[PDB]
Amino acid sequence: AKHPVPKKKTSKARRDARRSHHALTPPTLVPCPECKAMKPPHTVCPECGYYAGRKVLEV
Amino acid sequence: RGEVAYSGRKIWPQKHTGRARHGDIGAPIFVGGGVVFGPKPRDYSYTLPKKVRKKGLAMAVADRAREGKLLLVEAFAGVNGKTKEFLAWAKEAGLDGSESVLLVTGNELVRRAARNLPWVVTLAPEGLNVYDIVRTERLVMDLDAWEVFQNRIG
Amino acid sequence: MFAIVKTGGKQYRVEPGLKLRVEKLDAEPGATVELPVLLLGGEKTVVGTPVVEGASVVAEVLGHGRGKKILVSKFKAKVQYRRKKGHRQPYTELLIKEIRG
Amino acid sequence: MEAKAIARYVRISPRKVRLVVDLIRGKSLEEARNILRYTNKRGAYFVAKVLESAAANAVNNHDMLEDRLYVKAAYVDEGPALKRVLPRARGRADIIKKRTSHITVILGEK
Amino acid sequence: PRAKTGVVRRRKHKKILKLAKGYWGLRSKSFRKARETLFAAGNYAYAHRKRRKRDFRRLWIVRINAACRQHGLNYSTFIHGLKKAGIEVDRKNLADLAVREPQVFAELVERAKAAQ
Amino acid sequence: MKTYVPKQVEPRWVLIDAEGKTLGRLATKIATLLRGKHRPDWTPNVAMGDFVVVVNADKIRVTGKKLEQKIYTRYSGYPGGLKKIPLEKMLATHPERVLEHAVKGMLPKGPLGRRLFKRLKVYAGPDHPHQAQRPEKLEV
RNA sequence: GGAUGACCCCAGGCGGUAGGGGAGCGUUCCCGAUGCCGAUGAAGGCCGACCCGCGAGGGCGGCUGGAGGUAAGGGAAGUGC
RNA sequence: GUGGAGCCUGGGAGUGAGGGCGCGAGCGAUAACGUCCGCGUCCGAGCGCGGGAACAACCGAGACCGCCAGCUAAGGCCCCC
RNA sequence: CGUGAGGGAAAGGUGAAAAGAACCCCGGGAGGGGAGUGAAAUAGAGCCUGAAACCGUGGGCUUACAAGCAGUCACGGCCCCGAGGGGUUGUGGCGUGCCUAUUGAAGCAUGAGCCGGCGACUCACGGUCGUGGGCGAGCUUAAGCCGUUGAGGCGGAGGC
Ligand SMILES: [K+]
Ligand SMILES: [K+]
Ligand SMILES: [K+]
Ligand SMILES: [K+]
Ligand SMILES: [K+]
Ligand SMILES: [K+]
Ligand SMILES: [K+]
Ligand SMILES: [K+]
Ligand SMILES: [K+]
Ligand SMILES: [K+]
Ligand SMILES: [K+]
Ligand SMILES: [K+]
Ligand SMILES: [K+]
Ligand SMILES: [Mg+2]
Ligand SMILES: [Mg+2]
Ligand SMILES: [Mg+2]
Ligand SMILES: [Mg+2]
Ligand SMILES: [Mg+2]
Ligand SMILES: [Mg+2]
Ligand SMILES: [Mg+2]
Ligand SMILES: [Mg+2]
Ligand SMILES: [Mg+2]
Ligand SMILES: [Mg+2]
Ligand SMILES: [Mg+2]
Ligand SMILES: [Mg+2]
Ligand SMILES: [Mg+2]
Ligand SMILES: [Mg+2]
Ligand SMILES: [Mg+2]
Ligand SMILES: [Mg+2]
Ligand SMILES: [Mg+2]
Ligand SMILES: [Mg+2]
Ligand SMILES: [Mg+2]
Ligand SMILES: [Mg+2]
Ligand SMILES: [Mg+2]
Ligand SMILES: [Mg+2]
Ligand SMILES: [Mg+2]
Ligand SMILES: [Mg+2]
Ligand SMILES: [Mg+2]
Ligand SMILES: [Mg+2]
Ligand SMILES: [Mg+2]
Ligand SMILES: [Mg+2]
Ligand SMILES: [Mg+2]
Ligand SMILES: [Mg+2]
Ligand SMILES: [Mg+2]
Ligand SMILES: [Mg+2]
Ligand SMILES: [Mg+2]
Ligand SMILES: [Mg+2]
Ligand SMILES: [Mg+2]
Ligand SMILES: [Mg+2]
Ligand SMILES: [Mg+2]
Ligand SMILES: [Mg+2]
Ligand SMILES: [Mg+2]
Ligand SMILES: [Mg+2]
Ligand SMILES: [Mg+2]
Ligand SMILES: [Mg+2]
Ligand SMILES: [Mg+2]
Ligand SMILES: [Mg+2]
Ligand SMILES: [Mg+2]
Ligand SMILES: [Mg+2]
Ligand SMILES: [Mg+2]
Ligand SMILES: [Mg+2]
Ligand SMILES: [Mg+2]
Ligand SMILES: [Mg+2]
Ligand SMILES: [Mg+2]
Ligand SMILES: [Mg+2]
Ligand SMILES: [Mg+2]
Ligand SMILES: [Mg+2]
Ligand SMILES: [Mg+2]
Ligand SMILES: [Mg+2]
Ligand SMILES: [Mg+2]
Ligand SMILES: [Mg+2]
Ligand SMILES: [Mg+2]
Ligand SMILES: [Mg+2]
Ligand SMILES: [Mg+2]
Ligand SMILES: [Mg+2]
Ligand SMILES: [Mg+2]
Ligand SMILES: [Mg+2]
Ligand SMILES: [Mg+2]
Ligand SMILES: [Mg+2]
Ligand SMILES: [Mg+2]
Ligand SMILES: [Mg+2]
Ligand SMILES: [Mg+2]
Ligand SMILES: [Mg+2]
Ligand SMILES: [Mg+2]
Ligand SMILES: [Mg+2]
Ligand SMILES: [Mg+2]
Ligand SMILES: [Mg+2]
Ligand SMILES: [Mg+2]
Ligand SMILES: [Mg+2]
Ligand SMILES: [Mg+2]
Ligand SMILES: [Mg+2]
Ligand SMILES: [Mg+2]
Ligand SMILES: [Mg+2]
Ligand SMILES: [Mg+2]
Ligand SMILES: [Mg+2]
Ligand SMILES: [Mg+2]
Ligand SMILES: [Mg+2]
Ligand SMILES: [Mg+2]
Ligand SMILES: [Mg+2]
Ligand SMILES: [Mg+2]
Ligand SMILES: [Mg+2]
Ligand SMILES: [Mg+2]
Ligand SMILES: [Mg+2]
Ligand SMILES: [Mg+2]
Ligand SMILES: [Mg+2]
Ligand SMILES: [Mg+2]
Ligand SMILES: [Mg+2]
Ligand SMILES: [Mg+2]
Ligand SMILES: [Mg+2]
Ligand SMILES: [Mg+2]
Ligand SMILES: [Mg+2]
Ligand SMILES: [Mg+2]
Ligand SMILES: [Mg+2]
Ligand SMILES: [Mg+2]
Ligand SMILES: [Mg+2]
Ligand SMILES: [Mg+2]
Ligand SMILES: [Mg+2]
Ligand SMILES: [Mg+2]
Ligand SMILES: [Mg+2]
Ligand SMILES: [Mg+2]
Ligand SMILES: [Mg+2]
Ligand SMILES: [Mg+2]
Ligand SMILES: [Mg+2]
Ligand SMILES: [Mg+2]
Ligand SMILES: [Mg+2]
Ligand SMILES: [Mg+2]
Ligand SMILES: [Mg+2]
Ligand SMILES: [Mg+2]
Ligand SMILES: [Mg+2]
Ligand SMILES: [Mg+2]
Ligand SMILES: [Mg+2]
Ligand SMILES: [Mg+2]
Ligand SMILES: [Mg+2]
Ligand SMILES: [Mg+2]
Ligand SMILES: [Mg+2]
Ligand SMILES: [Mg+2]
Ligand SMILES: [Mg+2]
Ligand SMILES: [Mg+2]
Ligand SMILES: [Mg+2]
Ligand SMILES: [Mg+2]
Ligand SMILES: [Mg+2]
Ligand SMILES: [Mg+2]
Ligand SMILES: [Mg+2]
Ligand SMILES: [Mg+2]
Ligand SMILES: [Mg+2]
Ligand SMILES: [Mg+2]
Ligand SMILES: [Mg+2]
Ligand SMILES: [Mg+2]
Ligand SMILES: [Mg+2]
Ligand SMILES: [Mg+2]
Ligand SMILES: [Mg+2]
Ligand SMILES: [Mg+2]
Ligand SMILES: [Mg+2]
Ligand SMILES: [Mg+2]
Ligand SMILES: [Mg+2]
Ligand SMILES: [Mg+2]
Ligand SMILES: [Mg+2]
Ligand SMILES: [Mg+2]
Ligand SMILES: [Mg+2]
Ligand SMILES: [Mg+2]
Ligand SMILES: [Mg+2]
Ligand SMILES: [Mg+2]
Ligand SMILES: [Mg+2]
Ligand SMILES: [Mg+2]
Ligand SMILES: [Mg+2]
Ligand SMILES: [Mg+2]
Ligand SMILES: [Mg+2]
Ligand SMILES: [Mg+2]
Ligand SMILES: [Mg+2]
Ligand SMILES: [Mg+2]
Ligand SMILES: [Mg+2]
Ligand SMILES: [Mg+2]
Ligand SMILES: [Mg+2]
Ligand SMILES: [Mg+2]
Ligand SMILES: [Mg+2]
Ligand SMILES: [Mg+2]
Ligand SMILES: [Mg+2]
Ligand SMILES: [Mg+2]
Ligand SMILES: [Mg+2]
Ligand SMILES: [Mg+2]
Ligand SMILES: [Mg+2]
Ligand SMILES: [Mg+2]
Ligand SMILES: [Mg+2]
Ligand SMILES: [Mg+2]
Ligand SMILES: [Mg+2]
Ligand SMILES: [Mg+2]
Ligand SMILES: [Mg+2]
Ligand SMILES: [Mg+2]
Ligand SMILES: [Mg+2]
Ligand SMILES: [Mg+2]
Ligand SMILES: [Mg+2]
Ligand SMILES: [Mg+2]
Ligand SMILES: [Mg+2]
Ligand SMILES: [Mg+2]
Ligand SMILES: [Mg+2]
Ligand SMILES: [Mg+2]
Ligand SMILES: [Mg+2]
Ligand SMILES: [Mg+2]
Ligand SMILES: [Mg+2]
Ligand SMILES: [Mg+2]
Ligand SMILES: [Mg+2]
Ligand SMILES: [Mg+2]
Ligand SMILES: [Mg+2]
Ligand SMILES: [Mg+2]
Ligand SMILES: [Mg+2]
Ligand SMILES: [Mg+2]
Ligand SMILES: [Mg+2]
Ligand SMILES: [Mg+2]
Ligand SMILES: [Mg+2]
Ligand SMILES: [Mg+2]
Ligand SMILES: [Mg+2]
Ligand SMILES: [Mg+2]
Ligand SMILES: [Mg+2]
Ligand SMILES: [Mg+2]
Ligand SMILES: [Mg+2]
Ligand SMILES: [Mg+2]
Ligand SMILES: [Mg+2]
Ligand SMILES: [Mg+2]
Ligand SMILES: [Mg+2]
Ligand SMILES: [Mg+2]
Ligand SMILES: [Mg+2]
Ligand SMILES: [Mg+2]
Ligand SMILES: [Mg+2]
Ligand SMILES: [Mg+2]
Ligand SMILES: [Mg+2]
Ligand SMILES: [Mg+2]
Ligand SMILES: [Mg+2]
Ligand SMILES: [Mg+2]
Ligand SMILES: [Mg+2]
Ligand SMILES: [Mg+2]
Ligand SMILES: [Mg+2]
Ligand SMILES: [Mg+2]
Ligand SMILES: [Mg+2]
Ligand SMILES: [Mg+2]
Ligand SMILES: [Mg+2]
Ligand SMILES: [Mg+2]
Ligand SMILES: [Mg+2]
Ligand SMILES: [Mg+2]
Ligand SMILES: [Mg+2]
Ligand SMILES: [Mg+2]
Ligand SMILES: [Mg+2]
Ligand SMILES: [Mg+2]
Ligand SMILES: [Mg+2]
Ligand SMILES: [Mg+2]
Ligand SMILES: [Mg+2]
Ligand SMILES: [Mg+2]
Ligand SMILES: [Mg+2]
Ligand SMILES: [Mg+2]
Ligand SMILES: [Mg+2]
Ligand SMILES: [Mg+2]
Ligand SMILES: [Mg+2]
Ligand SMILES: [Mg+2]
Ligand SMILES: [Mg+2]
Ligand SMILES: [Mg+2]
Ligand SMILES: [Mg+2]
Ligand SMILES: [Mg+2]
Ligand SMILES: [Mg+2]
Ligand SMILES: [Mg+2]
Ligand SMILES: [Mg+2]
Ligand SMILES: [Zn+2]
């Protein structure tokens, strides 16, 4: 190879257009049926330790 | 560049570094280097012709004589070296301080009595010069100072 | 009733009560000036060849002024030639009084 | 009435933390708390502390009701950078910039 | 005595940058790019003041051509007939008549028709 | 005084029959109508011409040996991608394209000229679907 | 013409590199100055769509700033990127 | 023949790589956007303007500034124009 | 920094006065919000003034069928200030960066990432022309000496 380099400085408009897909998506959250705390679906609730209507881990 | 404190070493080689070529950091293109065509100690005096000097002095006094601004004094009666005495003499002479005065006299006690007044410039007769005359609005001379002036512009 | 008049090397369509800017006139403010007529229109159509012999427009001079400054710039590449000049065109403002015809 | 809080000279890149701040701009305080808890980014730890400090200021200092608070404004400004050496091959020394952020949250009432 | 740059360069640079407002990118933020843009802008303005007179004359002639051909004759015949009759209304005022006073324009068409 | 500027006007629908017309000499007249240059209030930077409906486009007439000698070309961007179609084949397979191609090349290039081309409606056969607009017949 | 720039009138000119000539603007410092301006706000900074100048520029107004600035007329340069 | 004509005296230069075209020659192969001279021209310095699709030197023509006035030059008048 | 001889930086300013912010609140702290001091705290110690490049938030106009040295001329729409003006740009016309070097460059020839600051025709002594003054068959002093403390005069050796 022979060391490729940028030919021109990237303009402000062009670099910010490249970042048009960079925004984060908020996490998916559902209420816990037992304690009504927001938590990701299909995970054991970290506040009360319930999953599928039964106690799983001690909190 | 020859008088700054830096050494004469070439900072980096002439070719193949990718930088601009340079010698020593004393060169004027460098920040902190020597100065190109800066001031050096200088003598600004020159010999103006004597005839022009004498002609200028006579014209300056004649200019004050045009306007009625030249006054001659036989003697300063009450002036003996106290500032309040000169003020009393100046009041009866018509010098109330509204105009600046060049006071030429060989009387030392008169010169020291008028020195502190902001509107008075004091000169011995040997020191008469056109810059002081033109600066001030009035010219007050002694007869002894007058005779020295006549001899000078002979 | 409108007219086509000639002043300042240009032609203008005028009506009574119109305020018009023309080239500077050697007339004092508040005085009246008369303009040659090329054509009359409206109730009747009179066409000059080139000037309608009897017609004139009465205009009152409101004042004289200077137009907004125009920048006149010149540049020639690779020759160190640059020129900058400000220009303000004088004018005379008229009020059209009546169309005699 | 507005309640603001600023965290200054936080040792984190402004670009990275600006992604987290955009998630909570305009949200209610309750929604903002839940979003930041389960955002898998380092910046969410710092943003949450400023958000909770601003919420305390609203009730404690400015007589604002906690149930009506929402994020009216939020932004990240760049602070002074820390310049560090990174050795490269063949004796070349590079400079690493360790940037810092100022994080502002402003709360209003709905 | 020493006379350093002081404030003179900043004030000159601000004058150029105020003239370059609205230009794209560095053409309104960098003094060097802004000055280059203004060299071309000045030449364009001078050149386009000249051809504005030709642009408008072109517009008037086309409009006169359409009005003439609604009366069964073309532009070149109409202008020749006007000159033969001695009418010196210019194209700017003829175009205004063609669109604002079409009945006066009909009268002028008849004079040009009879003149030839 | 300033030059008159027209306000927006509802546009005119016009019907042209292409039976037996010379192709190029008909296309000139269409291009003038689409530009609206028959109007004393013509303005170069607005779309103010007529909507033009053409019928019997398949019955256009050409002089000389142009039926076998005039070649339309299309380039696909691939190697060897130059396609050549003689006029007689184009008349048989896409009759409307012949008059469309001639008029398009006579319009200004750019956004406004592209809009003007959209106002031309060409049909092979004597019928057109624009009876609601009621195009007035024009003799070319 | 009037009386040497008092302004008017007439005639002809006014693309331009190397280069010759002329006329101006701005910067630092000095005389003017034991003066004048300044806490009712100096210098500097940010604005202006306002005024004067062919132009380089100069005024004026608002905001910021918080202690300096400096005339007409002249002089001297570390004088304009 | 009164012209940014001419002559004389003195101060200050820059230039001393030219190029295209037309005509007259040499060299060359009666080749070169070749080379070397003579006479003119233009570009150089008019990469300012109109025509020649585009284009220093081909045709038109020597740009002090302004105008939404008029006549022309080369070249054009079916549409793009 | 260099084995060494040697090379050789950067870095000044709160306020009149520390009166340099007790105490409370969030926070592990840092930092902040109140309170308090001060004429002033975007004078809070990362401290006078605080330009530009550069980064960001909010608002007005605009943009996803469109061919561009980025402007310019014209018309139209929208927003703002109050007869006019300012901001923005939809469409149409026109349009080959700057500098240098060259017979000739938009040139695919040189230099420049951008901004701020430093950066290049001088001085001394002779000479030669021009010019503002002084004196004129004459003109003029040098070194020094006396005097002043930003005062000048004397000195004719010598030079032309
Ligand atoms: K040193
Ligand atoms: K400088
Ligand atoms: K100020
Ligand atoms: K030649
Ligand atoms: K355009
Ligand atoms: K507008
Ligand atoms: K070269
Ligand atoms: K070369
Ligand atoms: K060459
Ligand atoms: K090269
Ligand atoms: K260069
Ligand atoms: K000399
Ligand atoms: K001399
Ligand atoms: Mg390999
Ligand atoms: Mg390889
Ligand atoms: Mg490889
Ligand atoms: Mg390899
Ligand atoms: Mg590589
Ligand atoms: Mg590469
Ligand atoms: Mg590269
Ligand atoms: Mg490059
Ligand atoms: Mg490159
Ligand atoms: Mg760039
Ligand atoms: Mg880019
Ligand atoms: Mg790049
Ligand atoms: Mg951007
Ligand atoms: Mg882009
Ligand atoms: Mg990109
Ligand atoms: Mg659930
Ligand atoms: Mg040394
Ligand atoms: Mg040495
Ligand atoms: Mg050495
Ligand atoms: Mg040395
Ligand atoms: Mg050495
Ligand atoms: Mg050495
Ligand atoms: Mg070395
Ligand atoms: Mg090298
Ligand atoms: Mg070298
Ligand atoms: Mg290199
Ligand atoms: Mg390199
Ligand atoms: Mg390199
Ligand atoms: Mg490099
Ligand atoms: Mg270098
Ligand atoms: Mg380098
Ligand atoms: Mg470098
Ligand atoms: Mg070197
Ligand atoms: Mg060096
Ligand atoms: Mg040196
Ligand atoms: Mg340096
Ligand atoms: Mg230095
Ligand atoms: Mg140095
Ligand atoms: Mg030094
Ligand atoms: Mg030093
Ligand atoms: Mg030197
Ligand atoms: Mg030197
Ligand atoms: Mg020196
Ligand atoms: Mg020096
Ligand atoms: Mg001297
Ligand atoms: Mg001197
Ligand atoms: Mg002498
Ligand atoms: Mg005194
Ligand atoms: Mg004194
Ligand atoms: Mg005028
Ligand atoms: Mg211009
Ligand atoms: Mg140019
Ligand atoms: Mg140009
Ligand atoms: Mg040029
Ligand atoms: Mg250039
Ligand atoms: Mg160019
Ligand atoms: Mg140049
Ligand atoms: Mg050059
Ligand atoms: Mg050149
Ligand atoms: Mg040139
Ligand atoms: Mg130039
Ligand atoms: Mg000139
Ligand atoms: Mg000028
Ligand atoms: Mg987001
Ligand atoms: Mg991160
Ligand atoms: Mg923190
Ligand atoms: Mg907290
Ligand atoms: Mg920032
Ligand atoms: Mg390494
Ligand atoms: Mg590495
Ligand atoms: Mg490595
Ligand atoms: Mg090493
Ligand atoms: Mg190593
Ligand atoms: Mg690097
Ligand atoms: Mg880095
Ligand atoms: Mg940082
Ligand atoms: Mg912040
Ligand atoms: Mg100083
Ligand atoms: Mg400076
Ligand atoms: Mg400056
Ligand atoms: Mg400034
Ligand atoms: Mg700008
Ligand atoms: Mg701007
Ligand atoms: Mg803009
Ligand atoms: Mg951009
Ligand atoms: Mg920009
Ligand atoms: Mg900027
Ligand atoms: Mg800016
Ligand atoms: Mg340009
Ligand atoms: Mg220009
Ligand atoms: Mg012009
Ligand atoms: Mg032009
Ligand atoms: Mg013109
Ligand atoms: Mg024309
Ligand atoms: Mg149109
Ligand atoms: Mg149309
Ligand atoms: Mg045919
Ligand atoms: Mg055939
Ligand atoms: Mg093939
Ligand atoms: Mg093939
Ligand atoms: Mg293919
Ligand atoms: Mg002249
Ligand atoms: Mg010119
Ligand atoms: Mg001329
Ligand atoms: Mg000239
Ligand atoms: Mg001094
Ligand atoms: Mg002085
Ligand atoms: Mg002094
Ligand atoms: Mg006062
Ligand atoms: Mg103030
Ligand atoms: Mg100063
Ligand atoms: Mg100021
Ligand atoms: Mg100010
Ligand atoms: Mg100003
Ligand atoms: Mg001062
Ligand atoms: Mg002063
Ligand atoms: Mg210098
Ligand atoms: Mg400058
Ligand atoms: Mg001679
Ligand atoms: Mg000279
Ligand atoms: Mg000479
Ligand atoms: Mg010279
Ligand atoms: Mg010479
Ligand atoms: Mg030479
Ligand atoms: Mg020679
Ligand atoms: Mg030679
Ligand atoms: Mg030679
Ligand atoms: Mg050569
Ligand atoms: Mg040669
Ligand atoms: Mg020649
Ligand atoms: Mg030759
Ligand atoms: Mg030829
Ligand atoms: Mg030839
Ligand atoms: Mg030839
Ligand atoms: Mg020939
Ligand atoms: Mg020949
Ligand atoms: Mg021969
Ligand atoms: Mg030959
Ligand atoms: Mg032969
Ligand atoms: Mg040949
Ligand atoms: Mg060639
Ligand atoms: Mg040749
Ligand atoms: Mg020969
Ligand atoms: Mg020859
Ligand atoms: Mg010859
Ligand atoms: Mg020849
Ligand atoms: Mg010649
Ligand atoms: Mg010539
Ligand atoms: Mg020539
Ligand atoms: Mg020519
Ligand atoms: Mg020439
Ligand atoms: Mg040319
Ligand atoms: Mg050219
Ligand atoms: Mg050139
Ligand atoms: Mg060119
Ligand atoms: Mg050239
Ligand atoms: Mg031609
Ligand atoms: Mg040409
Ligand atoms: Mg052409
Ligand atoms: Mg063409
Ligand atoms: Mg061609
Ligand atoms: Mg050409
Ligand atoms: Mg050309
Ligand atoms: Mg030519
Ligand atoms: Mg011309
Ligand atoms: Mg003219
Ligand atoms: Mg004609
Ligand atoms: Mg003709
Ligand atoms: Mg001619
Ligand atoms: Mg036409
Ligand atoms: Mg070491
Ligand atoms: Mg050591
Ligand atoms: Mg070592
Ligand atoms: Mg050591
Ligand atoms: Mg050691
Ligand atoms: Mg060393
Ligand atoms: Mg330092
Ligand atoms: Mg301080
Ligand atoms: Mg202090
Ligand atoms: Mg203090
Ligand atoms: Mg104080
Ligand atoms: Mg606490
Ligand atoms: Mg703390
Ligand atoms: Mg704390
Ligand atoms: Mg806080
Ligand atoms: Mg605090
Ligand atoms: Mg207080
Ligand atoms: Mg207080
Ligand atoms: Mg208080
Ligand atoms: Mg402040
Ligand atoms: Mg302050
Ligand atoms: Mg504080
Ligand atoms: Mg500060
Ligand atoms: Mg500081
Ligand atoms: Mg202070
Ligand atoms: Mg500071
Ligand atoms: Mg500040
Ligand atoms: Mg900025
Ligand atoms: Mg800033
Ligand atoms: Mg920026
Ligand atoms: Mg928005
Ligand atoms: Mg909006
Ligand atoms: Mg889009
Ligand atoms: Mg669209
Ligand atoms: Mg399409
Ligand atoms: Mg586009
Ligand atoms: Mg553009
Ligand atoms: Mg431009
Ligand atoms: Mg426009
Ligand atoms: Mg649109
Ligand atoms: Mg468009
Ligand atoms: Mg367009
Ligand atoms: Mg174009
Ligand atoms: Mg181009
Ligand atoms: Mg060009
Ligand atoms: Mg330039
Ligand atoms: Mg070069
Ligand atoms: Mg050159
Ligand atoms: Mg070359
Ligand atoms: Mg050269
Ligand atoms: Mg040359
Ligand atoms: Mg050659
Ligand atoms: Mg290049
Ligand atoms: Mg290249
Ligand atoms: Mg390139
Ligand atoms: Mg070279
Ligand atoms: Mg270079
Ligand atoms: Mg550059
Ligand atoms: Mg570069
Ligand atoms: Mg550089
Ligand atoms: Mg850059
Ligand atoms: Mg670099
Ligand atoms: Mg930049
Ligand atoms: Mg720069
Ligand atoms: Mg720089
Ligand atoms: Mg800076
Ligand atoms: Mg320096
Ligand atoms: Mg020197
Ligand atoms: Mg000197
Ligand atoms: Mg000398
Ligand atoms: Mg001498
Ligand atoms: Mg000589
Ligand atoms: Mg003289
Ligand atoms: Mg004498
Ligand atoms: Mg004499
Ligand atoms: Mg003195
Ligand atoms: Zn739960």
mmCIF file of C-alpha atoms in Angstrom, chain E residues 58-114:
data_model
loop_
_atom_site.group_PDB
_atom_site.id
_atom_site.type_symbol
_atom_site.label_atom_id
_atom_site.label_comp_id
_atom_site.label_asym_id
_atom_site.label_seq_id
_atom_site.Cartn_x
_atom_site.Cartn_y
_atom_site.Cartn_z
ATOM 1 C CA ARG E 58 -35.428 41.415 -24.396
ATOM 2 C CA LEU E 59 -38.505 41.002 -22.178
ATOM 3 C CA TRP E 60 -40.265 44.017 -23.703
ATOM 4 C CA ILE E 61 -39.616 42.885 -27.286
ATOM 5 C CA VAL E 62 -41.029 39.400 -26.664
ATOM 6 C CA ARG E 63 -44.173 40.852 -25.081
ATOM 7 C CA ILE E 64 -44.613 43.307 -27.961
ATOM 8 C CA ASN E 65 -44.204 40.387 -30.374
ATOM 9 C CA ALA E 66 -47.086 38.501 -28.746
ATOM 10 C CA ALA E 67 -49.372 41.550 -28.807
ATOM 11 C CA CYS E 68 -48.569 42.324 -32.455
ATOM 12 C CA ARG E 69 -49.246 38.766 -33.615
ATOM 13 C CA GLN E 70 -52.711 38.935 -32.061
ATOM 14 C CA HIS E 71 -53.334 41.645 -34.696
ATOM 15 C CA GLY E 72 -51.954 39.755 -37.711
ATOM 16 C CA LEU E 73 -48.411 41.114 -37.969
ATOM 17 C CA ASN E 74 -45.014 40.343 -36.479
ATOM 18 C CA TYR E 75 -42.654 42.462 -34.375
ATOM 19 C CA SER E 76 -40.221 43.439 -37.132
ATOM 20 C CA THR E 77 -42.980 44.813 -39.372
ATOM 21 C CA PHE E 78 -44.523 46.702 -36.439
ATOM 22 C CA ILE E 79 -41.319 48.523 -35.477
ATOM 23 C CA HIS E 80 -40.630 49.506 -39.085
ATOM 24 C CA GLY E 81 -44.146 50.905 -39.429
ATOM 25 C CA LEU E 82 -43.764 52.894 -36.214
ATOM 26 C CA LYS E 83 -40.564 54.532 -37.485
ATOM 27 C CA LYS E 84 -42.169 55.367 -40.834
ATOM 28 C CA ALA E 85 -45.049 57.081 -39.017
ATOM 29 C CA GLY E 86 -42.541 58.915 -36.813
ATOM 30 C CA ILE E 87 -43.667 57.485 -33.460
ATOM 31 C CA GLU E 88 -40.860 57.361 -30.881
ATOM 32 C CA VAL E 89 -42.503 55.514 -27.982
ATOM 33 C CA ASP E 90 -39.883 53.130 -26.672
ATOM 34 C CA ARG E 91 -40.210 49.390 -26.148
ATOM 35 C CA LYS E 92 -40.618 49.809 -22.376
ATOM 36 C CA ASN E 93 -43.752 51.917 -22.856
ATOM 37 C CA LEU E 94 -45.032 49.891 -25.821
ATOM 38 C CA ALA E 95 -44.899 46.732 -23.702
ATOM 39 C CA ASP E 96 -46.813 48.475 -20.909
ATOM 40 C CA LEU E 97 -49.487 49.570 -23.393
ATOM 41 C CA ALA E 98 -49.727 46.042 -24.808
ATOM 42 C CA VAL E 99 -50.665 44.709 -21.365
ATOM 43 C CA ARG E 100 -52.335 47.656 -19.560
ATOM 44 C CA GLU E 101 -54.134 49.585 -22.350
ATOM 45 C CA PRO E 102 -54.782 47.063 -25.141
ATOM 46 C CA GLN E 103 -57.145 49.476 -26.917
ATOM 47 C CA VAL E 104 -54.431 52.127 -27.291
ATOM 48 C CA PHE E 105 -52.091 49.417 -28.595
ATOM 49 C CA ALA E 106 -54.677 48.543 -31.247
ATOM 50 C CA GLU E 107 -54.590 52.182 -32.373
ATOM 51 C CA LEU E 108 -50.790 52.101 -32.667
ATOM 52 C CA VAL E 109 -50.952 48.880 -34.703
ATOM 53 C CA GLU E 110 -53.244 50.603 -37.208
ATOM 54 C CA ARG E 111 -50.868 53.565 -37.570
ATOM 55 C CA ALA E 112 -47.931 51.230 -38.217
ATOM 56 C CA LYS E 113 -50.033 49.213 -40.675
ATOM 57 C CA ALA E 114 -51.051 52.292 -42.677
#
